[PDB]
């Protein structure tokens, strides 16, 4: 088999991010005005409802990274002044924020959304940002909120209506609300929301000017750095010189980043995200040995060569698994020598174990095509919790967040938590819902349905994980906050891993678009 070449290029390769002078001071300035408009409107209780709308616009203008002790003790002083007793406005807002913060507040605060009979108030509609709040707190609802499941149905139908008639009146609220229906915010990569959310704010009447000016300069600034990065991840890539020591697989560099700079974009989190893209892409060339290229012989040899974890065996192994043996080998070497100095090989050996189990459960399933073992779907499930790289790509960030990790999220990690086990599956079935139709045909088998009912049931039960996972993001606390964090972006990156093909050998216009917006196109003025 071929891959088709990487459709970028060299223009990654050397960065020449250009920057002016005093932008540090400017922004310094601008940073200031923004911590005394949160402390004014946090100081005085009349302007809570107002404190919430700014930490809105600061995490959806995407500088949420600048304020974070600000925004967490305000949020925190928010939860303990109200608790579950919010009742002014911005009730949808204050829901979705709070939950967004791990706080689980009810639904309680929505009753008064309807009439003594129990339908929408009249009023609701007749306010479009109001039925946008309530829409995307829809999003972080769990199973059982009927509420919400209404409030869903409701917003859509109204939302879907206005953005129709409004097209001729404000086009840009047109698509403002048309970008919504397409993709909640909760599901939206924080990031990509950023790019869009933007322009929208800047063109808003009321907008803060401060806040404006601030988003933009530090966008740019952060695109520098992430070009940074995928310039120093392009060079070790381009050394690897894939297209002469693995033939076999793919020339995706950019795309291992991309997932990378999903799991967090702050530039406190750099170091994670280059170690991240460096595993992804052996992850890549790994799964591309055993799933075509490998004999059985060859795989169980491969295997062995991983659980010794060592460069010393590199003559037991078939000649061309040599360069990726050497290439892991390095980079977990370089890794385990970091925590080695800050002294925490433990949290290593614990990442490393997750390594091997991945590559071991890789091997489970060649040894079921070899011996003509069945793969039931109990398996088919569970061993692609591992196999799909749930578990992995988690305590990657474990290890590229090693200031933060307790032994305690080790133990999360290795008791195979729900959350996990549900962004396998999800990741499962939005993959076979595009293509790995091999599953909706084979669901139709199963069920003697036609292609449009098992269509509705497929994503019927996608929207039933959905909420499965709010639920145990929700009710996580046992692994550090920007370790969930982590953790919930990765799982909602699969929507745009999946979104309308296989993205990594295609690669949908979609995909394409949103890499551009990230790292090519800079913000203006």
């Given at each position: ?6 459709i970028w290029?060299?223009q990654?390769?050397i960065?020449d991010n ?8 400017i922004v310094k ?13 946090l100081d ?9 709308k700014?930490?809105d616009e600061?995490q ?6 600048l304020?974070?002790q600000?925004?967490?003790?305000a ?6 002044t ?8 911005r ?5 979705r924020?709070?939950?967004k ?15 003594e ?9 007749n306010h ?5 709040e ?5 999003s ?6 009927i509420?919400?499941e209404?409030?869903?149905?409701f917003?859509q139908s ?14 840009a609220l047109?698509?403002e609300?048309?970008?919504?229906l397409?993709?909640?915010l909760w ?14 704010y800047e063109?808003?009447?009321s ?5 404006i000016?601030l988003?933009?300069?530090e ?11 995928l ?9 690897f010189?894939?297209k ?8 995706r560099i ?8 999903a799991?967090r974009?702050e530039p406190?989190?750099?170091r994670?995200r ?12 790994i ?7 490998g004999?059985?012989e ?5 295997t062995?060569?991983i ?8 003559d ?8 990726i ?8 070497t370089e890794?385990?020598?970091?925590l080695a100095?800050?002294g925490?090989?433990?949290i290593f050996?614990?990442?490393?174990e997750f ?9 489970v ?6 011996e003509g073992?069945?793969?039931?779907t109990?398996?088919?499930d ?5 196999t ?6 988690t305590?990657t ?5 090693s200031?933060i ?10 008791s195979?938590?729900?959350?996990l086990?549900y962004?396998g599956?999800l990741?499962?079935?939005?993959n076979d819902l ?17 292609e ?12 039933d ?7 145990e993001y929700?009710?996580?606390?046992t692994?550090?906050r920007?370790l969930?964090?982590?953790v919930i ?5 699969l ?9 990594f050998t295609?690669?949908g216009?979609?995909y394409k ?5 990230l790292?090519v196109?800079?913000m203006?003025?």
């Open positions: 088999a071929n891959f088709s070449p990487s290029g060299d990654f390769l960065v250009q920057v002016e002078q005093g932008v540090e001071q300035d601008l940073k200031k005005e923004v911590r005394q408009l949160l402390k004014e409107a005085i209780p009349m302007k809570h409802a107002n404190l919430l700014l930490v600061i959806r203008l995407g500088i949420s990274y304020f974070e600000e925004i967490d003790h949020l925190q002083h928010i939860y303990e109200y608790g579950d007793n919010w009742s002014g406005a009730s949808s807002l204050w829901f924020l709070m939950r913060q791990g706080y689980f507040v009810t639904c309680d605060v929505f009753n008064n959304h309807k009439d009979s129990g339908v929408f108030k009249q009023s609701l509609k479009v940002e109001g039925l946008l309530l829409y995307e707190a829809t972080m609802r769990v199973p059982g909120e509420i919400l209404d409030a869903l149905v917003t109204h939302l879907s209506i206005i953005a129709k008639d409004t097209l001729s009146i404000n086009p047109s698509t609300i048309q970008r919504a397409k993709k909640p599901k939206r990569l924080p990031r990509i929301e950023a790019v869009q959310y933007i322009p929208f063109q808003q009447d907008h803060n000017k401060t806040l000016k988003a933009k300069l966008f740019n600034l952060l695109q520098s750095l992430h070009r940074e990065e310039s120093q991840l392009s060079k070790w890539w381009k050394a010189d894939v002469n020591n693995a033939p076999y697989s793919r020339d950019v795309e291992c980043y991309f997932w990378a700079l799991s974009f406190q989190y750099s994670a280059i170690f991240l893209a460096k595993v992804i892409a052996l992850v890549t060339l799964d591309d040995i055993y799933d075509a290229y004999t059985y060859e795989l169980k040899i491969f062995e060569a659980e010794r974890w060592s460069i010393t065996c590199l037991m192994i078939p000649e061309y698994m040599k360069p043996y050497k290439l892991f080998m390095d980079t977990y890794m385990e020598e970091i100095k800050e925490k090989t433990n050996n614990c990442g490393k390594v091997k189990d991945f590559v071991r459960n890789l091997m399933e060649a040894q079921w095509a070899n073992h069945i793969p039931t109990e398996e088919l569970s061993v692609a919790v591992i799909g790289g749930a578990n992995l790509l305590t960030c474990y290890l590229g967040m200031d990790v307790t032994k305690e999220a080790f133990e999360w990690a290795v195979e938590p729900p959350l086990r962004k599956i990741g499962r079935r939005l595009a293509g790995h139709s091999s599953s909706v045909e084979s669901y139709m088998k199963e069920y003697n349905v036609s449009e009912y098992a269509k509705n049931l497929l994503y019927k039960q996608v929207e994980l959905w909420k499965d996972i709010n639920r929700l009710i996580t606390k692994i550090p920007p969930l964090v982590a972006n990765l799982v909602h990156f929507d745009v891993l999946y979104a309308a093909k296989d993205a295609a690669m216009e979609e678009n949103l890499v551009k917006s790292l196109y800079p203006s003025i």
